[PDB]
Design a protein around this ligand. Structure first.
Ligand SMILES: [Mg+2]
Ligand SMILES: [Mg+2]
Length: 172
């Protein structure tokens, strides 16, 4: 069975609901294990960042309407940071799953083989990302929460003016 993970979201400290993901561990096992462990916090402290390998209290720092919502920068909160559970970054595992629909879970990166902790959730088909970002899961519930994140007003760097925070997270 494929694992299922969750985020409980708050927007300016007001609960917005839970997003649940299914992870395609049969396609991208190393990528899925990283995300799963970042949900539970179970791998402890990031090697280079020296901060918890954990999405708890992390933000959705980049929102682009009709494109995606992105988070997981636990160490800098702005896209510059993060790290994987393996230390630093890990390689792009599979391009098998297409970015052909809303509500797919995919790895953010800064070029080839730079997977860390940052992830995004598509909000429309984004096929041009195929071969660039590894899709590794999908929303199963909480689509309306994702839409509420997507519709946030953002600053000049596409960061929501509201704090879109992962209040709690884990594995089901
Ligand atoms: Mg390779
Ligand atoms: Mg790129």
């Amino acid at each position: 069975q494929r694992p299922r993970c969750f985020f409980d979201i708050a927007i300016n400290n007001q609960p917005a609901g839970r997003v649940v993901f299914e992870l395609f561990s049969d396609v991208c096992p190393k990528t899925c294990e990283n995300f799963r462990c970042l949900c539970t916090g179970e791998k402890g402290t990031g090697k280079s960042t020296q901060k918890p390998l954990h999405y708890k209290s992390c933000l959705f720092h980049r929102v682009v309407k009709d494109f995606m919502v992105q988070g997981g920068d636990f160490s800098e909160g702005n896209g510059r940071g993060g790290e994987s559970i393996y230390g630093g970054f890990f390689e792009d595992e599979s391009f098998a799953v297409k970015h052909n629909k809303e509500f797919l879970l995919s790895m953010a990166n800064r070029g080839k083989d730079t997977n860390g902790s940052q992830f995004f959730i598509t909000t429309k088909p984004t096929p041009h990302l195929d071969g660039h970002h590894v899709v590794f899961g999908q929303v199963i519930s909480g689509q309306e929460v994702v839409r509420e994140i997507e519709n946030q007003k953002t600053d000049a760097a596409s960061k929501p003016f509201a704090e879109v925070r992962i209040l709690s997270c884990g594995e089901l």
